[model samples]
Target chain A: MFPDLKGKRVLITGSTEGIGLATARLFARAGAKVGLNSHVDPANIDETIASMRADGGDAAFFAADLATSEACQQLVDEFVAKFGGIDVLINNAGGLVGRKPLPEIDDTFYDAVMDANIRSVVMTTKFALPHLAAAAKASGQTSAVISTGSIAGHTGGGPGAGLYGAAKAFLHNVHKNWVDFHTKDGVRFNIVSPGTISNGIPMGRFGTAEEMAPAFLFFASHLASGYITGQVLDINGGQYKH
Target chain B: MFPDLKGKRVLITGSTEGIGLATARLFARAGAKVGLNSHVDPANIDETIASMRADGGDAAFFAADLATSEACQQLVDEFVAKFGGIDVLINNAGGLVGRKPLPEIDDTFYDAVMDANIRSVVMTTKFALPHLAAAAKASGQTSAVISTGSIAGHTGGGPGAGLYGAAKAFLHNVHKNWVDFHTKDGVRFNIVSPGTVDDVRDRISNGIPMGRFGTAEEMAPAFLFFASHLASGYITGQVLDINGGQYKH
Candidate 1:
């Protein structure tokens, strides 16, 4: 947990489960106003939010399908409306639409992968820009956007990740361009590319989401990742290097 | 000109002008059976072929647009048909479609940039794979695919390049992937990312840490390095940094 996140407002997409949810819990514990997004059943959302509230953490929920551009916009808008403003936007929602070979991949598969993994980040950043700019102006400080990228972005397909690798590669380049585009606007952007988390996903080895959550908190805390932008911080336990 | 290129059958895409033409001339002078590709002005093709021959070098010409997938196959087909087979495929036909701001770039602009800069490399490799494989088998040696990537790929758009940088970045990743995918096949793949060259294109001084343009001759040897996999046998999925330390990533 980072001390700089205290009183910081953070919005993490896909925060109901996996690394996103784990990151939301860590940031909430760090005293940030954490916003959780979930498409799960309402009961599960209530349980997660209730547990955070019981821990004396400030938390809110926004339920929306982030795979669509419109939903991404509305998610950001609702977070801003509820939290007054968001200082950190974590693009943590991503997955393969369907693990298919390159030749078998049609436009549907392409759009699905790109929309969920790439376009979601684009739309979220596009809609959250004004809010982040306003927050920066009000606090006399810079806000940060830390996207969740993957080692797939760096390595070519290991076994069955050709389409997935290409999608994440797009995120890596987008992170670089976003940093360049927003450095002067008082907004910093970077990527946390995890290698093989021990979480139940089961890929390379096993790395705990808890161990990787601090990096996200570090990025959210402007004091930590202040001068660091356009960087893909690999937290893969030496599983891959770029 | 690299002396090792002697007797090498080299096929260079977009060899009519600029860097592509320069590389073709260098290969021809070094005694390679150079195959030149041109999409514009058939006269330029005739002139380039004649120029190489006049200099007592073996050369051939194939006019084709590398922007289309079909044309890439046709280009490789003609090259193999004319020269028996190729030992090197130089993917040098690439360019920025237009210098426009990010907000002004439309689908057409994006598609054009991707097709010209990225798709050409992909399709070229796909088309040239069989011939390169055959040559490797027959000669009991390795061949290569050398792509001309750019510094923009390393550093994304900060200045004039938006889509251009993106396309170049795609090529860089594709080069890395291709190397890994084909290493066991005795085919080495790499990219030559030039920083900036001077008026003669002889001096490469564009804020590279070395403070000078790495001459085309200096850049030419790297192709030979990859072509002779014996020298670089263990290297794969690696980009040889040749920008005079201009970019150190």
Candidate 2:
């Protein structure tokens, strides 16, 4: 429904399935150039891109373990090389891989979650910064960065997922800094924080990935959220109030 | 602009002047019941409330230092006793009173800044929590808590205002936790982090995209939005920065 998104180069990490995939599909249907990424190459990669292209947008897949700065740089390079430039970047790569409480957390576990969640966003955004700014300069419109935050980012966490929540919280705070520093670059930063589709949401059930996709489209379209930046749009179904 | 705020009770700390005063004027114009507060009663306290009354809202004044929990409790007690209950609480009492580099921060200074900025909000909200929840339950709508945050809360701070900034960031994060824990309480938490207003140095303006400082009047509408459920019902655990696109450190 956002006409402004047509033909825009959009890059999404961890997009092979779930929320990222749903958002990518929406962008594809809007006739945008879409980049789908994951830590490991999926077996149905060709079918996925074909499906995206059939929806009326260009699509490609890149396999990268975004934990390292090198991989983040390589992913950006490859996407820019293929799409010409990035108009919108989505840092949706992180997840709660293994659960560990404070006492159970070791250096390895810490590195796993932090690298998967924190460093991935930090490095990928660092590499994509210039490209995003350039696109904004070329188009005379604001480029966009939308990170996937979690309800855990607001609350501490559930069970042994404290670090996962902490990492999301880190993204939450750091994006605010980016707005303070990067506003002059003509790029807008925002977040989409979702509660689990698991259970007990005030809406009486879990949320769906499909339900989470439209917010990404809203944040990506300057026509919709042109004056909005440094903000978090929480879609927790009243699971969390703030 | 918020018609629903017409009969709401709003308690604004440090409302004797500046942004708080401007917001109180707007709320008064909306015909809300407003409690204006400060550490000491201003000489024109009666006149100020009279003006607010003339604007069509019921107005009261409370004198409380708010540095101690006791004072925060007393302020809430007095405001509640008069207004019946609080539907909106504005934690707007804070400032960078004195410049201090990292080396110059002594225990006394640290305590002063934290007390004025952090403890004031914590204790005030602590005292107001039950009343806020009760109001929400009784009204079948959300009660709101809007704290005044700062751009420094995001940028680490400017020059010697690190502690003040830290205290604000503390509020920013604590509000998130409050949302997580208190969503069931029928209250909402949000923040308005204003950039430099009449409250800053001149070098700051050169970096602002709008080329000037914002007015306290300019900051009031956001308070109205966050206070009104119809305007921002789905928005909580958020900080709206009225920076005019300026994020200078």
Candidate 3:
């Protein structure tokens, strides 16, 4: 949780569950207008919004599949429409359909993983950039895009996550390239690569989403992360190092 | 020249002239059985061999445009036929065509630079891998691949070498990845990234950390050090870090 997000609009993709939802709650607690997105069941959307309001926070919901570029664009547009404009965009939606060997990964597997993990981040950022830029210009407020990467990005896929590993690896490079392009634009971009977290996130054999919450806060808070762009900060508990 | 390359089989790509030639001569002088490759002027082939032989070193000539995959394969095959087998593969034959911006770079420019710098290394190594593996198995010797990279590989690109920079960047990663894969096979892969050297083989910049452009002699020794296998047995998947400590990442 941060000290002050008062009046700040924060949009987090894949926020109905897992790390995204946890981060949404943290931002709302910090006094930001929170927008939650989920491609899953629409039934859970109202409860999420209600839960945030119940805790004396402003929250909204947008159900959208982030796998497509158009949906990513729409998610950003609707978030701006509902909450004014986003000051922070957490591009955290990612998963492989199933764990499999690298050679066994088919075209569908590759496309699904890459679209969800890498392409979504690019498209969402493309749509959010103008609004975030304008808002920062008017209010002299700094904007940020924090991406969730993994230790798998640093090392080769150890077991069945090779496809997922490759997608995350692409994300790491994209994060660096984006930061190089956008640093002077006053939009900070950084990747939080969590190592082996195991907090019941539906992932396997690792640390939990809860343990990685501080890293999200570290990237989202401009004062903390303003000078730190083009960096992949690993939170994998020493699982990997550059 | 490295002292340990005596009687070693050294295959240097693009060695008809320039830094590659310099490296080949240095290795030959150190008693290496030098295999010199040239893409231009088959006449330079005999002259290079004669030059090495006149200096009391054994030499072989392989003429092929290593920019193509088939040519790379043939070059390696010829070298193996003449010199028995290669103990070291110096992937040193890469360059840039024109200086252009990224968007301005066409497919031709991209392919040219990649062929010269990236694909050539892959193809050459793919062909040479079996020979090196067989040498290790038969003679209990450890082989090495020393790729000639540029300072641009580490620091990105200079004024007119963007495509070259990208190719060098890929080569650097290839060194890292290959070393990661082949260390267990007793094959050491490393990159020698030079800063700048003068035509007289002197270090050009007094401001460099080591106070000059590294000469072929200084750079060549690192290759021998890795290929010696005795001195470098414990070091694999490790870059020599030979930029006079310039641009430490």
Candidate 4:
């Protein structure tokens, strides 16, 4: 748990599983009021929040297909209503939705990947901007917007996952541009791209989802990085390192 | 032109041609007194400065084999003597000096590459840190220490040139630690890692989303960015990718 996030409001998309779930649980422990978003039912939402609340974390839940504009709008609107405003927004709703060579894939699959990854990124940021702006005004607080990207973005992936990687690359580039837009307003935009992390990562042999969560904690703490903005942090364990 | 650099003293190693040459010209235009380095004879050294001077820029030259540790110390010492102290040090001496697989590659070539790439880096920074610290005091100006690294450092280059790439990587990683050591004193340590210049391999031309080779002139601006304290002041212990988008992290 980070000392800086005691009362911060955070929204993490796709919190039902994997990295997103770990991020949500940890943010809650950090004492941030976390809004967990998933396309799954209220059953999943209620269960996770019940568990987090049992641990004494303030929690809210929203169910929406983040790939669609209407659901994206609803999630942000509901998150602000529940949290009273927003501080850190983790745009973490990305995964390789379809698998195949470019020639083997159809337009539908590509479109689905785009919606799941880039579309949710752009849409959620769009709706949350006003709420995020309002939160800073009321509290005089600096804010963080951290998105999940990938190693494939930096080193383009192979075969079926290539465009999924390419989609990530596109998202990462826009994250920098978002800095230019939001930095003047006191919001920092950053990214975390994980390497082939099936296990402990680095080469990743296996580990906790919480391993990647600390990066978000780093960006959330102004003491850790108030001066850093628009930087993409690549989590490769020790990979590609000399 | 960056206003903060109007009267600063800048020294660039391995500046006889290519990226170093372009950087020398650029700093001259920005109104800094530039010291050029090369292992080539003074005749080659004199011409680059003559052309720089003809363009109404301040220029001087020094000759040394950067692969040798004594040469690195002498370069820094002689540079301070020439300029009265140093302000900006560009550690840009890099070329593909070795090209054998790890097994076939002998110790001499490996040591030479390490000396050429990382040793020159570690040695020059060690010698220049004092001078740079002093120049900041005397001139009442900011200072910078920049090195040239490569994408190969990140990717681990072709089988033959892997360690050469590894050497640049070594230099780049230490740069961040230098920030911790030097930032409080106001000196910035940074790197520019270029990917496949125009003369480079094919993937850069056809692949990499940015799609094309970047000019040495194009690279000079990033150098300029790092030099201007108010503009690129936040950049320290960081690498700027100037390759045509071949690899970005």
Candidate 5:
């Protein structure tokens, strides 16, 4: 069963497209006031929000390059100001940026990947917790910290995506500490890892964005998984061994 | 959603009681011809088997200290003999053993833990895959390699579990490699990690969000999920936390 997240405030980062975007949309569909975050103020942000609202979702966009800690803090602070409190934090923006082999990996590229994937989540979590705690206490509800880790964290990724995978590993493990630290505070942290989800995946079928919807919905509602933390629900659709 | 599992051959190690026993029972209830494994031929083995039969579960016991490589090899070879082929291998026999801090840890215990926790599962997975593959092909059903990991590895448990946690990390990663190598073969590998089951349920549960530990039976559905083609047909190299939501990733 899923939780009724109606009127709940959820902040989902890197929500312009893909899983991030879908998660934001799903949370909105669940009747939550969704904070939509993107790095470049994607020309599509307003369109996406307006579209969700057209469907009766309480959605708004907050643009910031999560590559920097300052922007992460600004985004969370701003969300709290508008929503009055933050109940959920989804650190979902990350990518290979571009493939870089071990031989060709430069310092700048390494810093960028590591910062964008790992540090940004860390900083965002660092800034969002205080508000998450406050809102949980005020609402008598459980809070959650969910991120987008990858099967890469488990498999080390394919060639050229090694660094991206490594950062995911770091992000994946960080929540272990978060779970251990914040369980008493009623906040849970987790990752929903996607493997080869479709035709190219080993399963010979692609798992679509809708296929990933259940995990986001499940983790977002404490009634369903408030006790869950430091776990990865793999939705790779049989690309990896079960 | 759950899978319809009946008449499958499942081998569950360390199933004398607790989580191991519960897993064995569930697989049997699912109509799988279950191989019941334990470290010793406990007096209750017959009783357990009788009970499973009473409940209409097909089961038999394979007793050996899984900490030994010889015994692990024998278990697989013998299971192959008994069942013609093995479909599911549940690497669930492991304990905290003795708690040892870093300086206090010695080579003997380290070796013992490695042999017990990591090596045994690896050895079993290695030996069992051929049969698991053979059976899946023969029966037109999916196969699985489900090992028991712990949230302890993720949280760096209390005092003595560091090495145990490390070994589990090894087990965890080994399955990843198995996934990378075995996906083409149609076999799934996964870990069902219990937060604190049986004995330490409450004490260890204080820090978990779920506020409770799991029963070995509670962990059984997870293994079944991995084994089922319909429920989680595409999940692999993954760990499912059954610790009442203690840890979510």
Candidate 6:
């Protein structure tokens, strides 16, 4: 529905499946030049691109585990090389890694969780900054960086998901500083804090990954949400109220 | 744009002007049965209703000084009398009565600010609860109660607006309990915390991401989103900040 999104260059990491994939498909349908990323390339890469193109848009896949700053830099470089520039950056790379309780947890697991969740967001955006800034300058409009946060970030996460939860909390808080500094760069930073898509809640259902995609579209479109930044929109089914 | 709102009854308090009026107009355009409230009837009440109906919806006026619980009760009773049951209640009747610093502040001033901002929201929502609950029950859909919150609620008020700010903070915090207790009634409560719509200096403008204050029109959509079950059925007890990226919570 947002016509301005047509031809916009969008880079979404950790987007091979689930919420990120749903968002990628929406952008592709909007005719955005979509770059989908994952730590490793999916086996059905051609099929994914074919499905995305079926709706009408350019689509490409880049492989880079965003856990490391070096890989993040390469991912942005590769995306800009193909798409020409970055108009929207989706910091969607991150995961629970696994559930390891405190005693069972080690520095290795902690680093892994933080690397996957927090570090990935910061480094990926850091690498995409110049392209995002340049895109805004060229268009005389604001570029956007949308990140994936979690309800766990607020309620501390389910059993054994503490590290993942705290890492998300870290993601949630750091966007504030990014907005404080980066607004001048013509880039807006926002977070989509998805509530538990799981069980027992007021709406009495788990939220769908598709349900989570629209907020990403809303935050990314300057015409739709240009005045909004440094915000976290929770898409949980009233599972947690913030 | 929200088709489900057609024929839905909406009650908006302190809605003769500004943000509330903007929202009321949008709801009316959606063809909702709208009740516009003010402490005193607008001098152009008939004219206002004419303009509202120009777009095709039912509009009525209720004059009740919502500073008192009795007036709030009468306001809700009268609105229901006219428009059937209310499916949406907007606690938009609150404002900075005046500016007064700490040393000069008095009990009368405090009472006025609290009565206008906080008391009005609580009392209006209290009286509308049963109808809101019933509307939800009858429709098998969630009824909505949306309140107007402010940037001052987070950063405290600007200058002598502290009391007004604190009252808004009270409104923001109290909704949590309403959700906890009233969700069983199938009514959802959400807040629209707006940022500075007016500013002082270039420095203030520079701080916002959009480098501007928000328009009332910009503030209108979030209300529609919150009021429509199709848009936000699973959402409640959340604050959607519509500040031009100035303050975030």
CA lDDT of every candidate: 0.73, 0.85, 0.70, 0.74, 0.76, 0.86
User: What TM-score does prediction 1 earn?
Assistant: 0.80
For residue A202, give model 1's deviation from the true position in Å. Answer: 18
Ranking of all candidate structures by their DockQ, best first: 6, 1, 5, 3, 2, 4
In the range B1-249, model 3's lDDT, one tens digit per residue, is 555567778888877776777777767677889877767656666777787887767887777776677798778888898878878888888876677543244446645765677667766876787777677676575787788877765554554465465456556654554554555566777777766544334433655677666666566666667667677766655555566766674
lDDT of 2 by residue, B1-249 (tens): 456788899999999898899889889977899989988888988988898999998898888887899999989999999988999999999988798999999999999999999999999999999999999999888899999999889887778889988999999989887876786788889888888778357777877754567778767767876787654555567777766566522
Measured on C-alpha atoms, candidate 3 has an lDDT of 0.70
* Alpha carbon deviation, residue B214, candidate 1 (Å): 5.2
Evaluate model 1: give its lDDT.
0.73
TM-scores of the candidates in the order shown: 0.80, 0.58, 0.64, 0.55, 0.61, 0.88
lDDT of 5 by residue, A85-145 (tens): 8888888888888898889999999988988898899999999998888877887777888
All DockQ scores: 0.27, 0.07, 0.09, 0.03, 0.24, 0.45
lDDT of 1 by residue, B145-186 (tens): 888877767776544455566666666665565565566566
Which residues of candidate 1, in runs, are more than 4 Å off? A3-9, A31-85, A96-127, A160-170, A197-205, B1-8, B38-43, B56-85, B99-110, B197-206, B209-218, B229-235
Docking class of 1: acceptable
Q: Tens-digit lDDT track for model 2 on A101-198?
A: 78999999989888999999999999999999999989998899999999898887789999998899999999878987887898988888888743
Which model, 1 or 5, shows the larger DockQ?
1
Chain A, candidate 1, TM-score of: 0.92
Question: What are the per-residue Cα lDDT tens digits for candidate 4 across B87-159?
Answer: 7889998777858887888888888777788888898889899888877667554588888888788888865
Clashing residue pairs found in predicted model 2? A242-B236, A242-B237
RMSD of 3: 7.1
Q: What is the DockQ of candidate 2?
A: 0.07
List native contact recovery per candidate, as a fraction of 1: 0.17, 0.07, 0.00, 0.01, 0.46, 0.43
DockQ score of candidate 4?
A: 0.03
**Worst 10-residue stretch by lDDT in candidate 5 chain B?**
B1-10
lDDT of 5 at B11: 88
